[PDB]
Amino acid sequence: ETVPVKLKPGMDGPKVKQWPLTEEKIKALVEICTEMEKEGKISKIGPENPYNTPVFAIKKKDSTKWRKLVDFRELNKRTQDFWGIPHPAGLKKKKSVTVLDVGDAYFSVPLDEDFRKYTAFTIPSINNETPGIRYQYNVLPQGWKGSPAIFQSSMTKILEPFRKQNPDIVIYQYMDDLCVGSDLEIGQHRTKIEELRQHLLRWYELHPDKWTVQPIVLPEKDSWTVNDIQKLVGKLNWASQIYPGIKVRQLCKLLRGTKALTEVIPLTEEAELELAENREILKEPVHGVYYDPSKDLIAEIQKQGQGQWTYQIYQEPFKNLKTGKYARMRGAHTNDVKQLTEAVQKITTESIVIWGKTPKFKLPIQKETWETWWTEYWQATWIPEWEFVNTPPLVKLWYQLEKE
Amino acid sequence: PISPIETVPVKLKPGMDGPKVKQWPLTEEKIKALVEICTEMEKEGKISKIGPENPYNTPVFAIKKKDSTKWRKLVDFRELNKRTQDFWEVQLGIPHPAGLKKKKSVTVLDVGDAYFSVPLDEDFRKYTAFTIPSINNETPGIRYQYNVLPQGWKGSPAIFQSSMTKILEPFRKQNPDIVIYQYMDDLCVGSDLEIGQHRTKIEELRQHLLRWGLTTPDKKHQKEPPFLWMGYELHPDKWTVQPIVLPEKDSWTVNDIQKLVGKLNWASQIYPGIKVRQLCKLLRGTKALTEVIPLTEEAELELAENREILKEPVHGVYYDPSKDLIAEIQKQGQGQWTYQIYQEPFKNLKTGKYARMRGAHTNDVKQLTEAVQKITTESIVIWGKTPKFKLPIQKETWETWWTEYWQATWIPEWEFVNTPPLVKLWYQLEKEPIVGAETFYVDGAANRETKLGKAGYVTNRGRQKVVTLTDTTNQKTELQAIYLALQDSGLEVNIVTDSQYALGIIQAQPDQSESELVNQIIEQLIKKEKVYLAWVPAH
Numbered sequence: 042e043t044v045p046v047k048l049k050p051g052m053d054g055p056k057v058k059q060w061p062l063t064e065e066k067i068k069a070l071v072e073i074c075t076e077m078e079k080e081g082k083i084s085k086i087g088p089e090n091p092y093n094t095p096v097f098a099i100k101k102k103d104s105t106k107w108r109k110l111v112d113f114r115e116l117n118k119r120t121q122d123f124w125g126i127p128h129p130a131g132l133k134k135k136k137s138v139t140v141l142d143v144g145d146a147y148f149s150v151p152l153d154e155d156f157r158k159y160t161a162f163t164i165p166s167i168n169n170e171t172p173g174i175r176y177q178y179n180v181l182p183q184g185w186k187g188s189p190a191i192f193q194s195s196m197t198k199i200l201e202p203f204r205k206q207n208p209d210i211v212i213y214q215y216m217d218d219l220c221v222g223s224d225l226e227i228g229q230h231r232t233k234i235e236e237l238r239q240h241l242l243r244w245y246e247l248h249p250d251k252w253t254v255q256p257i258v259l260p261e262k263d264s265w266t267v268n269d270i271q272k273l274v275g276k277l278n279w280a281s282q283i284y285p286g287i288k289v290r291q292l293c294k295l296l297r298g299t300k301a302l303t304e305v306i307p308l309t310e311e312a313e314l315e316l317a318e319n320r321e322i323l324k325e326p327v328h329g330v331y332y333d334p335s336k337d338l339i340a341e342i343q344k345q346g347q348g349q350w351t352y353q354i355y356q357e358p359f360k361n362l363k364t365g366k367y368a369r370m371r372g373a374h375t376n377d378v379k380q381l382t383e384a385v386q387k388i389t390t391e392s393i394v395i396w397g398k399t400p401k402f403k404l405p406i407q408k409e410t411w412e413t414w415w416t417e418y419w420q421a422t423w424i425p426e427w428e429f430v431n432t433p434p435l436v437k438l439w440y441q442l443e444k445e
Numbered sequence: 446p447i448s449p450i451e452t453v454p455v456k457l458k459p460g461m462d463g464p465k466v467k468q469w470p471l472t473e474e475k476i477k478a479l480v481e482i483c484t485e486m487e488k489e490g491k492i493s494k495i496g497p498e499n500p501y502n503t504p505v506f507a508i509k510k511k512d513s514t515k516w517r518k519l520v521d522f523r524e525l526n527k528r529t530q531d532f533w534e535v536q537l538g539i540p541h542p543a544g545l546k547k548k549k550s551v552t553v554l555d556v557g558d559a560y561f562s563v564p565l566d567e568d569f570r571k572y573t574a575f576t577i578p579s580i581n582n583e584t585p586g587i588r589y590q591y592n593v594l595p596q597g598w599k600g601s602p603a604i605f606q607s608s609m610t611k612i613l614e615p616f617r618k619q620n621p622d623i624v625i626y627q628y629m630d631d632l633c634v635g636s637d638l639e640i641g642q643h644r645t646k647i648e649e650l651r652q653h654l655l656r657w658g659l660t661t662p663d664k665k666h667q668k669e670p671p672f673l674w675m676g677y678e679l680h681p682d683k684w685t686v687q688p689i690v691l692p693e694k695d696s697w698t699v700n701d702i703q704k705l706v707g708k709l710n711w712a713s714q715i716y717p718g719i720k721v722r723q724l725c726k727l728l729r730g731t732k733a734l735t736e737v738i739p740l741t742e743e744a745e746l747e748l749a750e751n752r753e754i755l756k757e758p759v760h761g762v763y764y765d766p767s768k769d770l771i772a773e774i775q776k777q778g779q780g781q782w783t784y785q786i787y788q789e790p791f792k793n794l795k796t797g798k799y800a801r802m803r804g805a806h807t808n809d810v811k812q813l814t815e816a817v818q819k820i821t822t823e824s825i826v827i828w829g830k831t832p833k834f835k836l837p838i839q840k841e842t843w844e845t846w847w848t849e850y851w852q853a854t855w856i857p858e859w860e861f862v863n864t865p866p867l868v869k870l871w872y873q874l875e876k877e878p879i880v881g882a883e884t885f886y887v888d889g890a891a892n893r894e895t896k897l898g899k900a901g902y903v904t905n906r907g908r909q910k911v912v913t914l915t916d917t918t919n920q921k922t923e924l925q926a927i928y929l930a931l932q933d934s935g936l937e938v939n940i941v942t943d944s945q946y947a948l949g950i951i952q953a954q955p956d957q958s959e960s961e962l963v964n965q966i967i968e969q970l971i972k973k974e975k976v977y978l979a980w981v982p983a984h
């Protein structure tokens with residue numbers, strides 16, 4: 042039967058506006074929706090229900106069929122807490138982790154009669170020649186936090202047989218997803234997953250070891266020009282915000298005077314050293330950097346250009362829990378947005394894999410631009426929170442510096 | 446009439462009470478009137494005369510309209526409303542001609558007092574109770590309450606609609622080739638059949654509705670094509686724009702020049718070439734609305750010019766799903782763009798322009814991209830698809846800018862079109878220092894409190910200068926150092942500065958701003974043949 046669930050004290054239901062959709066997408070949601078309607082998973086609703094959540098279609102994996110995606114981000118945020126599964130740290134250390142879509146579990150269990158209103162979602166009609174098709178969930182919704190929570194006992198209860206049939210394989214669950222990590226070589230691993238699929242059915246290829254952070258590498262030259270140094274120094278200056286040990290004193294003197302930008306400058310052994318002394322500090326991640334679980338996780342991104350995108354994951358300014366780069370995916374060559382959503386999903390999966398939670402993004406794109414098209418390329422079942430920013434012209438020059 | 450309709454479960458906002466307002470007393474002439482009507486409605490099943498067992502009340506007024514000058518009642522729900530729960534949004538997104546699929550024939554059905562036709566949540570009426578006063582506060586008046594969706598009540602629009610919807614589900618599935626639209630009381634019904642088939646179908650619908658209580662107006666009130674929809678004459682073959690009259694007087698007040706310009710601005714979206722710069726100009730420093738401002742010659746001329754444009758017919762075509770969706774864009778001016786979406790050359794579905802999107806600092810390509818997305822979002826809503834783009838810009842220009850900009854950006858599939866003015870990059874900082882070019886080491890300094898400063902540079906070639914700036918911000922100076930530099934250099938310059946603001950100009954090489962300064966620098970930058978900007982930390 043059902044379990045009583047409420048909203049955080051004094052919170053009211055979400056009343057988010059459903060963003061405009063494509064025709065092809067709408068026809069799909071309709072099909073889909075009438076389906077669950079018949080299956081009793083959802084029932085249409087009157088106008089006296091003022092809540093509402095955004096909905097949309099996905100073309101996840103090889104399929105002419107679309108998946109249905111609802112944005113319970115606001116609902117999740119407003120939903121009471123339940124104290125989920127603790128973190129299997131080691132998961133990140135496996136040679137290969139895989140992920141699965143089990144949101145389909147949920148539809149099984151009934152949703153408390155008194156919480157459903159809050160789950161109201163709406164399908165639009167082109168040019169508004171029709172009021173939207175209002176519905177509200179009866180069963181557990183895919184994408185709602187409470188779901189994996191409620192369906193926890195029944196979930197674990199079905200995994201143990203595997204967890205024990207294989208104890209060298211770690212299994213982590215987040216929302217609709219599930220992550221499997223084993224050191225077995227590919228086949229044995231992949232094959233092994235299916236064994237689990239068969240399992241779970243009877244009711245992502247990641248390799249996190251070769252992963253994480255990388256260093257900054259300063260340029261070197263037979264000969265250095267005024268500009269080369271100028272840039273060099275400008276960058277080191279910033280860098281001292283992460284590494285105070287860094288110094289540009291000698292180098293700056295080399296700059297005294299006002300010769301052509303292109304004029305070559307001979308480096309003093311002092312500067313020569315000081316440069317070596319900085320190549321050393323930068324050779325490693327700053328110390329005393331530990332992830333605080335009670336703090337929000339942040340993920341920032343800069344668009345290097347040429348299909349390049351650096352990112353950083355931190356909780357405190359200049360204390361990266363991790364930094365990385367991402368190159369565009371074959372077949373996005375003229376679409377900034379594709380790569381960006383493309384990158385985001387990836388940084389989120391790493392965040393979930395490593396710390397088991399989703400970072401908060403700072404995106405170098407226009408709200409309108411993003412909002413107009415992210416869905417066109419989204420594939421995850423989850424959705425991170427995001428804010429849009431104006432890239433500091435240096436945070437970039439600095440990271441465009443990492444070694445490859 | 447009333448109906449056999451499942452009412453909607455309505456409630457008062459979180460922990461509140463129904464309206465408790467005293468009945469404004471009235472004249473004997475307004476009473477005898479109100480009592481009259483409340484007898485009819487009373488018997489039409491709409492209202493129920495309840496007893497003193499009701500603390501809730503609303504003010505019943507009495508006005509005379511034109512269509513009869515016969516007394517017409519009015520109930521003030523401003524209170525029941527604000528105390529009434531909230532509903533989901535009543536379709537605020539309304540259809541647009543350009544998005545209507547043309548139809549063999551289209552009927553418009555006035556759904557009459559559809560409002561008073563639907564039952565009220567019985568477990569709610571009480572809050573609608575109101576009281577017909579007695580001759581100036583005499584004994585107790587007559588107490589009533591509504592049994593149906595009340596005119597002027599907050600949830601009526603929403604509830605009525607849903608009803609109509611549930612009722613249309615059937616007829617609609619019973620012939621998926623007949624498209625119907627609900628709004629206010631307008632049930633516009635069309636289809637691709639033969640007038641007979643059609644005519645005969647409407648009659649089926651009307652009777653169907655009637656089967657529930659929804660009585661549809663006379664042969665009298667019956668509306669006849671074309672139809673007016675927010676300034677549009679609509680025939681089911683195409684649409685014309687409901688012409689707009691430009692009054693001509695010898696006495697123009699502020700109030701007027703605004704109302705005027707107002708309408709004009711709206712007319713820019715359809716008519717090509719409508720300007721109001723000079724008209725807007727007449728509002729400068731006005732001291733009050735009724736103020737009568739004399740029109741300048743310019744104001745009289747463009748004003749006179751516009752009169753003609755509007756005296757031109759701008760028809761329209763409907764949406765044919767079987768044909769491409771094309772959108773073409775023009776740069777009417779810096780920051781100013783116009784667009785027209787059409788399926789067949791010259792048969793425009795929709796046009797429009799976007800008031801100059803002035804900002805802190807952008808570039809054309811940027812702005813274009815924004816116009817592009819604003820359009821796209823529009824399209825999706827109208828047709829549920831994005832159009833093909835015909836843009837006044839070369840793919841090379843596009844690749845260069847975009848493939849390098851610090852911000853995620855994109856333009857859905859498009860095609861170049863050479864409809865000058867084309868949009869281009871007025872300049873492009875060098876990727877590296879220029880060999881040969883003179884090198885300026887600029888610096889700007891001023892007291893932010895005294896607002897007094899200096900600005901200048903010193904080139905590697907020995908050149909130099911400085912200037913005393915009275916009343917300025919430290920920025921203005923720095924940038925000024927930069928300005929002078931570009932002034933006093935050749936057509937290739939190397940400039941270094943520690944101003945983190947210039948660093949911004951580097952990353953975004955904007956071609957338009959707010960401060961004449963930046964602006965001036967742009968005009969300068971644009972002039973040089975090669976410019977290399979260099980930033981370096983200060984002190």
Ligand SMILES: Cc1ccnc2c1NC(=O)c1cccnc1N2C1CC1
Pocket residue numbers: 170540545546547548551552624625626633634635636672674679680681682763
């Ligand atoms: C005002 C309005 C709003 C929405 N749709 C329509 C209309 N009116 C029409 O006259 C119309 C014209 C052409 C195509 N559909 C139209 N109709 C639809 C009913 C056939």
